[PDB]
Structures are given as structure tokens and as C-alpha cells.
Amino acid sequence: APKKTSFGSLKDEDRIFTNLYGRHDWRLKGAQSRGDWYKTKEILLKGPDWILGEVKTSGLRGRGGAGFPTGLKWSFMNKPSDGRPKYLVVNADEGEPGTCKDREIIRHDPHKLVEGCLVGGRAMGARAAYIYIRGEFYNEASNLQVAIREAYEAGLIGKNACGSGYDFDVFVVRGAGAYICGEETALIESIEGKQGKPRLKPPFPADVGVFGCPTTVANVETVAVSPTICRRGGAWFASFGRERNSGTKLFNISGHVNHPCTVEEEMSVPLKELIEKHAGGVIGGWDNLLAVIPGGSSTPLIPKSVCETVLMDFDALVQAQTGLGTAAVIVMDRSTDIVKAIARLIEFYKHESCGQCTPCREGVDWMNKVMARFVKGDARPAEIDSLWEISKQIEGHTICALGDGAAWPVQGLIRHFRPELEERMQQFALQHQ
Amino acid sequence: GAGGALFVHRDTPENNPDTPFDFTPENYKRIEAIVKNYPEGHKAAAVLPVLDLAQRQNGWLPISAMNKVAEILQVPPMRVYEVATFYTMYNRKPVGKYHIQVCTTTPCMLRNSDSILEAIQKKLGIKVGETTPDKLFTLIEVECLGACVNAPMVQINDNYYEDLTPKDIEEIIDELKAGKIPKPGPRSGRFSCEPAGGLTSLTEPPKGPGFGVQAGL
Amino acid sequence: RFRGEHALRRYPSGEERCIACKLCEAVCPAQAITIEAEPRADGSRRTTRYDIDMTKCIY
Amino acid sequence: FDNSTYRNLQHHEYSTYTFLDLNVELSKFRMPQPSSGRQSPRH
Amino acid sequence: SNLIEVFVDGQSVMVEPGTTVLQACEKVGMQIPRFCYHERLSVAGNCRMCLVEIEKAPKVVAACAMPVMKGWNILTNSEKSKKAREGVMEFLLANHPLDCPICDQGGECDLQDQSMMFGSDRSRFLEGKRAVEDKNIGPLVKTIMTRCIQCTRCIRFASEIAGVDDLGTTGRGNDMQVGTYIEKMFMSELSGNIIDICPVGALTSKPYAFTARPWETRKTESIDVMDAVG
Numbered sequence A: 001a002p003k004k005t006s007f008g009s010l011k012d013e014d015r016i017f018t019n020l021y022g023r024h025d026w027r028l029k030g031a032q033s034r035g036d037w038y039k040t041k042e043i044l045l046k047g048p049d050w051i052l053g054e055v056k057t058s059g060l061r062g063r064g065g066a067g068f069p070t071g072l073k074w075s076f077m078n079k080p081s082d083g084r085p086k087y088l089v090v091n092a093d094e095g096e097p098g099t100c101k102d103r104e105i106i107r108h109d110p111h112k113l114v115e116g117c118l119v120g121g122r123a124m125g126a127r128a129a130y131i132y133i134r135g136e137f138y139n140e141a142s143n144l145q146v147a148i149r150e151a152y153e154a155g156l157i158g159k160n161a162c163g164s165g166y167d168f169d170v171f172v173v174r175g176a177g178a179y180i181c182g183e184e185t186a187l188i189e190s191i192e193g194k195q196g197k198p199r200l201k202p203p204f205p206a207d208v209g210v211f212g213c214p215t216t217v218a219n220v221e222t223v224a225v226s227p228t229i230c231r232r233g234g235a236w237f238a239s240f241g242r243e244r245n246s247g248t249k250l251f252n253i254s255g256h257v258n259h260p261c262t263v264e265e266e267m268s269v270p271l272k273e274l275i276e277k278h279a280g281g282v283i284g285g286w287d288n289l290l291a292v293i294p295g296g297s298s299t300p301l302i303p304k305s306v307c308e309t310v311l312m313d314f315d316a317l318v319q320a321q322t323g324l325g326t327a328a329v330i331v332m333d334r335s336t337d338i339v340k341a342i343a344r345l346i347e348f349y350k351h352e353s354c355g356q357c358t359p360c361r362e363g364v365d366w367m368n369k370v371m372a373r374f375v376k377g378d379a380r381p382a383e384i385d386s387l388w389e390i391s392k393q394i395e396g397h398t399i400c401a402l403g404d405g406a407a408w409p410v411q412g413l414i415r416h417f418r419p420e421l422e423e424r425m426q427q428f429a430l431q432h433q
Numbered sequence B: 001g002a003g004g005a006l007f008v009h010r011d012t013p014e015n016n017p018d019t020p021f022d023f024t025p026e027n028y029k030r031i032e033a034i035v036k037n038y039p040e041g042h043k044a045a046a047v048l049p050v051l052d053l054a055q056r057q058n059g060w061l062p063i064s065a066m067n068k069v070a071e072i073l074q075v076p077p078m079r080v081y082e083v084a085t086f087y088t089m090y091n092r093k094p095v096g097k098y099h100i101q102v103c104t105t106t107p108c109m110l111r112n113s114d115s116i117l118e119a120i121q122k123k124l125g126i127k128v129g130e131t132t133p134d135k136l137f138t139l140i141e142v143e144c145l146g147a148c149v150n151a152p153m154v155q156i157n158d159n160y161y162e163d164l165t166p167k168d169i170e171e172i173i174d175e176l177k178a179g180k181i182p183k184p185g186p187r188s189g190r191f192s193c194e195p196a197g198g199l200t201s202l203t204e205p206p207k208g209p210g211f212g213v214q215a216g217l
Numbered sequence C: 001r002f003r004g005e006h007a008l009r010r011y012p013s014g015e016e017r018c019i020a021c022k023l024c025e026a027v028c029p030a031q032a033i034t035i036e037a038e039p040r041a042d043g044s045r046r047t048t049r050y051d052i053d054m055t056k057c058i059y
Numbered sequence D: 001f002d003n004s005t006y007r008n009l010q011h012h013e014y015s016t017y018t019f020l021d022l023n024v025e026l027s028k029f030r031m032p033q034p035s036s037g038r039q040s041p042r043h
Numbered sequence E: 001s002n003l004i005e006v007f008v009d010g011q012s013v014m015v016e017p018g019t020t021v022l023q024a025c026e027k028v029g030m031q032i033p034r035f036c037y038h039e040r041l042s043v044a045g046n047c048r049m050c051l052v053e054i055e056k057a058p059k060v061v062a063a064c065a066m067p068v069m070k071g072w073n074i075l076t077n078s079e080k081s082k083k084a085r086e087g088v089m090e091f092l093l094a095n096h097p098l099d100c101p102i103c104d105q106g107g108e109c110d111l112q113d114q115s116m117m118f119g120s121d122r123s124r125f126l127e128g129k130r131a132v133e134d135k136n137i138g139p140l141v142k143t144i145m146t147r148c149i150q151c152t153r154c155i156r157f158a159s160e161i162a163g164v165d166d167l168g169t170t171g172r173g174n175d176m177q178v179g180t181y182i183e184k185m186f187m188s189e190l191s192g193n194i195i196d197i198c199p200v201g202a203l204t205s206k207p208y209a210f211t212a213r214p215w216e217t218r219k220t221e222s223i224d225v226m227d228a229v230g
């Protein structure tokens, strides 16, 4: 029967990332045995239109955090050639606090990523794939290079790439410690040998991207699943999760949980089931839970009142006023300082701003100072509303979406934990007068 | 708090434009291989790796290294200065042989990262910005390293050491001092991103090649 | 608040307070103030001419 | 069959130049790079 | 012909394809506040002072970089545009030094004038301010870097008009700074122009320092005889 209602119990027969834990060989021989690099030539020979259609039918949404529909986005490079080469860029930066999915995909299933690069480049008509990986992921990048080497030797990429007739290259470029370089335009700038400063849009990368050529930027997870969707079909991928929330998803459950880990799960699984089944629940019981950040630091946190009934997909968490983000659940129990955690996140954002645009460069540092004073209680209640307005000024007025990610956790803390702030201010005034 | 590092350069007898720096011939072969990846006429794109390569041979980046990279790639030196001061992995000052980077962001802090930081400080006798007098270690704090599930974690010269308690990090320091190299990864009998006990999923053997393939392919 | 004869003041160190911003010269409704300035020998922003015509001044 | 062993130990034996050595090795299979028609944007 | 019709405050105008919102507003004689846009330099989009509201669009766009779309209705005086300008002025003035009486830019300051015209009249900033060390780029251009609003006009002029790549930005975020990173003299036959294009007192004339204020000067339009260009 269609339109399921209780999502969140899928067996290992339907998991794309079968070597998530690295128990099995991560090398090509192991990848092929699991089901990788199977019928690649057939998929390539089906053409870009067929490949684009499969992505579209699946309903695949961008796993990098924004959730833009993947098929429509990829179809933006279906234009005829204009003399410029076309490129696919894989975003392997993974800078969001709480997020470790791309690291595991790269280190334990690199051939999935390489095949995803090949199929995505064929769909876009791209000439080569640049994989921008985090600089701190030295071993992951080296495993990726070993995988690309054994794919080149076996003729799975490079000239003709198959019995296919299509030439495709895969390059790995390492960053050097910059979270802002996860942004697609800032990533493009960092590939071209500049500071990782985001561009303004328009133009979008499909018009003017890397080296000024048409480019498509895709998240590692988004690309890896591309070949499995092609082989099984978009209809199958869709058969999971609610409407407009199709497919499976990697979740990183960390913080105050008994067994922090990462796990593949159906999209619309309830948060409570995910936390209590895979992560072993909150230390101190479920009633010890204080707050949850469902999608990495860039998303507003939610209190226990919402966490017990919210689904883990895009629209459900949007209705909870937070957002799915990178599907990186950070759990905080009743034993933590909720203001201190948000202050640390704001300090991270202050240290990660590129400084290009005025609202981010000035207001995030301003919010950091205000939040550090809030932690002690130095402030007055009239500043809390003031702080709210500061965030509003920052949000939607910056080039880059780092300003949004800096302003949203503060808004969440003020929306849900204002009384704690006020009582901290009252206490500081009481013992200071 | 504040960065602490200055973003101007003042010449010193140990760091001036005449400080001796040059790539090894092997590093020149590697530079040629790096340069070839990018499209012709876009050679600058190699500023990020080649600069890193310099730091991998010298240990840090003297101003002469930046000048050499700028001259090799025919990029104006101020562009290389911009790249060097923007990215935090570039060392514009000498560091110890082992660069200890402990994560203190919120997911990593929630699992008692301060305990690790204090344990390192009391084991080495130095603070969160200083270098040990033997010039072997340098301790700093860093933002999220992407190993949050394994928090608390530390990064040392390209090796992650995760699931740390004070005793594990102390014995890693001991192993690094005595002239040995410690094995990277979790230090709690986990060796993965798996749940700490039970392996809630991925227990059944992975499906074979072509198991779920759709008709007409 | 009594308004009388004009005076130029100093900081407690003995350094003059005036920095030659010329706001007094701009605001003066009688145009009674004449100011000329240059960098001092130590680079300080100080006046070399500061006149008030007391028969122009309206106090 | 076994799922009790984390095979992934290749990285333990990785040195400082392993990534660049692999890049040099891979430089052989690469397709010819395209060209904009200039030596540089300042040419 | 190829002209497209767009509306500035409900008023029709015909513009060439690819024309930015700022130029369309300029066609009807309205000047959008700016700090980083200069019509003779490459577009930057960093200051964010030019943000305006397009009718039936939730997000304000940067007028200096965004090309007008056919049928668009700019709204240069809506509540959203005014609040954007007020917020951006607030962020600009947060770390700015209280230097107007000693600043040579005093009566000629774009920051001062746009604060008076489009910003608020008050401060709600209760923290300490940042301070940066001064750079020495020669005997012609005095440098007081604390005043810099990070427009990057100097960097674009030096790179594109003068042909020199000596200026740049080091560091990132709040600590990002404009300079040369080394003791270097920005010496060129067109160097002094970076004083004119810098909107604040960060870059000033060293020979002119402290001598005059703009309201007292008399302007005589004349010709140069130092060469044959006139």
C-alpha cells in the first residue's frame, strides 16, 4: 500500500553505503564484489537524458544541506557546448560541526564516489571531475587517490573510461583548513588559487563556474548515491521517505548519547526512534534530554517538547522552525549549559567568517561578544531583544549563507531558552549589584 | 578568543627574503605533476598545493618560500601572501616536530574535550599556544575536525586520534616522545564510526553485483 | 554657565587640547575665528594660527 | 565472511609525500588539459 | 529593440540587457547608497550598502551587481530597503574609530554623509572596538588603517587601473586587513588616486595633512600643465 506513515525501519538490503563501517575491503576488488562499477557502460550508453531522468524521478535532494532538488540542478548543464570545457566539482569539505558522513564515504567507499563522479559528469556532459577534499583529511584523500589509481589502471576512468567512448578525468584537490571553502563558490575560488571568498550569484556555477567554465557543485553523499539510483531506478529510491523527502540518509548522532555513531536510515524516521535505537538513547534516559540540534550547528536547536514527535526530513523540521541541514544530530542533556554551547558555536562562526562582506564580518564578531557576555550574565534583559534584531540584520543581507548559519542558532536559543538567559542575568546582578 | 598571530610580516635574521629555501628535485617533479592537472593559462590554481608542498619540505613557510612559489608559478607575491594568511593550515612561524591540534567545538566539547586539553597541558608543561622547549610539540585548539562522533579527538601531523581520555592522550604523548609512532583511530575498542556496542545495522552480508538492477539495463 | 572672555585649555599633562578640527570656526555665526593648522614636529595635529576677533564676536 | 575486522589499515603506512606520489603516478593516465589560449590572464 | 522595460518605484524605463539595478535607478535620477561600487572599477559587491527590495521578492538584492530583469519593479524607498541600509550602516560604524575631529576626511566623508542620510542617529554597540597597526606605503599616501571599512577599492584600482599587484587582504573575518604584508612602497605614477577613491580617512594625502577643511575651500576648475595630456 502506498503513502506509508511509519518510516524508519529499513534493513541492510536497501542501504546504499554497505561499507559504512569499513569492515569490508575499501579497495576496488571489494567495491566490485558488493555491487559497484556494475553496468557503468550501459548507464553511460543510455545517455545524459536518461541519467538526468532517473535523478529527477527519484526526487533526490541535495545532501550537502540545502536540499535543492538534484535532478533539476543537474539539468542546468544540459545546454550544448559553447567552446568552454565543462566540469563537475565534488564538495568533500565537510566543515559543519557534528557532521562526519562524507569522511566515512571517502575513506570506506571511495569507488562509490568515483563511479558517482563518472555518471554525474556523463549526465552533465562534463569533461572531468575535481574532488575538493578537506585538508585535514589526509588519509581519506590518500585512500581516495589509491581508489582513483586502481580505477585508472582497470580502465574504469580516463580515456574511454569503459567500453563506452567517453573520456573522463578525476582530480583530487586538497583544501587548507577553511570551513568557508565548503560553500560552492568559495570552493571554486579556492580551487583557482585564491582566498576562499564566495562569489555573488548570479552568475550561477552552471553559467560561470571553475576557471570561468560551466560547473556543477555536488555534495559527496549526493554523488555517491547517483549510480545506485541509476541501476535500481528513481522509482525505487523514491519508495522511501515522505513525499518530497525521498530516499535514505546518513545521520551523525553525537553529543549526549550513549553510543555516538553514524548510520544510514530512511529519510522520514522520527528523531526519537533514531536516537533511542541506533545511538542508545540519551545518557540519563530520554527524560534527561534538554535540546537537540538536528542538522549541524547551522540549524536552530529544538527543545524536548518538539523532539519527541518531529520527523527527520526537510519539510517536517522546517515546520518545527529548525531545518534538516546536514542531518547531524547533536544531543544535549539536562546536565549541560545551553548558553555555553550556543556561544561556542558563535565563536566557531566568528573564527570561520571569510571577512568579505560587512554584515558577516562585523555582526558575527559583535554577536560573539554579546554571547560571551550572555554566558556570564553581564548583560541586561533589554539586550536580548537587541541581540535578536542584530541577527535579523545579518540574516539575508550577506553574500554567503554563513551569516544565516551564524544568526539561526542565536535565534533558536532566544526563541526557546530566554528564561534561562534572564535568570542568569538576574543572578549576576544579584551577586554583583 | 582573539587570534594572536599577526598578519603583517617583519623581517628577522631567521625569516627574511634571503632566508635559504629551494625545492628538492623530487619536489620539482611533484610540482610539475601538480601543475599539469589544471587547464593551460590557469597555472595559479596550483598555489594552494605547491605552497603546501613547500611546508611539507621545510616544516613552515618562511617569506622566501612564498617568494619562491610566486616566482615558480609567475603569480604576484601578494597573491601568495593572501593565500598563506587566509588558510589556517599554513605555518608562517616554526612549529614543533609534532603539532597537536585538539578540537574544542560544541559536539567535541560536550564529550569533555577540556579534560583532554588540561591533560595535555599538565603532561607537556606548556599552554595552548606555546611550543615545548625541546621543540618537539606545539599545542593549539582548533574548530571542528569532522570527527565529532569520535569526540574527544586530537589531530597530529595528519593522524587522527579519537575517543580520547586523559590516559590515552598521555600515553600517545609518551609513545611519540620515545621515538615511536602510535596507531591512529579510536582508542576505545571501536576502530570505526560504529556504535560502541552492538552494531545496530550493517550486520548482514552486502548484496552482490546486480541484485537490485531494474529491468531494461 | 556665564559666557565671558575666551580661553584655550590644556590637558593635565600640559599638552593643548585643541586638535584643529575647525568646528568652532565653521559654527561661529560672526566668522570671528580664524584657524591655520599643520602637523607639528612630532606629527601632532595642532594649530599654527588661532585668532578670535573680539569685536566681531557675539559671545 | 566476516564483519569483525576493520581492514582499513593502509593509511597507517602513509607518509608525508604519499598523496603527491600518487598524484605523480596518476599524471600518466590523464587526458590532455584544455587551453584558454593564453599563458596567463596577464598575457 | 533589445531594450527591456523595468520599473523604478512604479515608473517605466527602458534599459539595455545586462544593466545593473543601480544603473536603472540612476536612469531616473536616483542614487543608490554605495561604498564599494565604483563605476570605473570591477564590481565587488562586498560592502552590502546598495541592497534594495524588488517587488514580489522576499530577498533584497545587491543593486551594484544584479542585472535588471524584464518587468522588475525596484523599490528604493521601501521599509525593507531603509532597514537594510540602517543595519549595514550599523555594522559599518560598530568598529569605526571616533576620529572625525582629527580625520582629514572630516567634511568630505562618504561614511559620514551616508550615516547622516540613510543610517540611524544612535549607537547600541556596547563592546570594545578593534584597532589595527598602520602601514607605510610611501611618502605620498598617509595610512591610518583603523578607519578602513574594507571596501577593497584600493586593491581593485591598483590591480586594474595602475597595473600593480602590491595591495591585498591578509587574514580573514574581523581581523582581515588591507595592506602589503611586507614593508613595501606603493610607488607608481597613478598612486595618489587611491586617496580619492578611498571613501574614508584610511588613505589620505600626506602633503595635505591637517592643513584645511573642505567647507572653507574655494574651487577653481583649471587645466594641468605638467605634461601634454591637459
Ligand SMILES: NC(=O)C1=CN([C@@H]2O[C@H](COP(=O)(O)OP(=O)(O)OC[C@H]3O[C@@H](n4cnc5c(N)ncnc54)[C@H](O)[C@@H]3O)[C@@H](O)[C@H]2O)C=CC1
Pocket: A062, A064, A065, A066, A067, A068, A073, A076, A093, A094, A095, A096, A099, A182, A183, A184, A204, A205, A206, A217, A295, A296, A298, A325, A326, A401
Ligand atoms: N556539508 C557541510 O559540512 C555543510 C553544509 N552546509 C549546508 O549548506 C546549506 C546552505 O548552503 P547554500 O549553498 O547557500 O544553499 P542554496 O540555497 O544557495 O542552494 C543549494 C544548491 O542549489 C543551487 N541553486 C539554488 N538556486 C539556484 C538557481 N536559482 N539556479 C541554479 N542553481 C541554484 C545552488 O547553486 C546550490 O548548488 C545550509 O542549509 C547547510 O546545512 C553548511 C555548512 C557545511
Ligand SMILES: Cc1cc2nc3c(=O)[nH]c(=O)nc-3n(C[C@H](O)[C@H](O)[C@H](O)COP(=O)(O)O)c2cc1C
Pocket: A061, A062, A063, A064, A065, A066, A067, A068, A091, A092, A093, A094, A095, A096, A179, A180, A181, A182, A183, A184, A217, A218, A219, A220, A222, A400, A401, A402
Ligand atoms: C559556509 C558554507 C559551508 C558549506 N560547506 C559544505 C560542505 O562542506 N560540503 C557540502 O557538501 N556542502 C557545503 N555547503 C553547501 C553547498 O552550497 C552545497 O554543497 C552545494 O550547494 C551543493 O550541494 P548539494 O549537492 O547538496 O546540492 C556549504 C555552504 C555554506 C554556506
Ligand code: SF4
Pocket: A180, A197, A198, A352, A353, A354, A355, A356, A357, A358, A360, A361, A398, A399, A400, A401, A402, A403
Ligand atoms: S556571509 Fe560571512 S563567510 Fe559568507 S561571504 Fe559574507 S563574510 Fe564571507
Ligand code: SF4
Pocket: C017, C018, C019, C020, C021, C022, C023, C024, C025, C035, E101
Ligand atoms: S579647532 Fe576649535 S572646535 Fe576644533 S578642537 Fe580646536 S578649539 Fe575645539
Ligand code: SF4
Pocket: C024, C027, C028, C029, C030, C031, C032, C033, C052, C056, C057, C058, C059
Ligand atoms: S561669535 Fe564668539 S562666542 Fe560665538 S561662536 Fe564665534 S567666537 Fe564663539
Ligand code: SF4
Pocket: E096, E097, E098, E099, E100, E103, E104, E105, E106, E107, E109, E110, E111, E112, E147, E199, E200, E201, E202
Ligand atoms: S573617515 Fe569619516 S567617519 Fe571615519 S573618522 Fe574620518 S570623517 Fe569620521
Ligand code: SF4
Pocket: E147, E148, E149, E150, E151, E152, E153, E154, E155, E178, E197, E198, E199, E200, E202, E203
Ligand atoms: S583603504 Fe580605503 S579604499 Fe582601501 S579597502 Fe580600506 S576603505 Fe577601501
Ligand code: FES
Pocket: A097, A098, A099, B103, B104, B105, B106, B107, B108, B109, B143, B144, B145, B146, B147, B148, B149, B151, B153
Ligand atoms: S566538534 Fe570535534 S571533531 Fe567535530
Ligand code: FES
Pocket: E033, E034, E035, E036, E037, E044, E045, E046, E047, E048, E049, E050, E051, E062, E063, E064, E065
Ligand atoms: S555597492 Fe553594492 S555591495 Fe557595495
Ligand SMILES: [Mg+2]
Pocket: E105, E194, E195, E196, E197, E198, E199, E200, E201, E202, E203, E204
Ligand atoms: Mg580617502
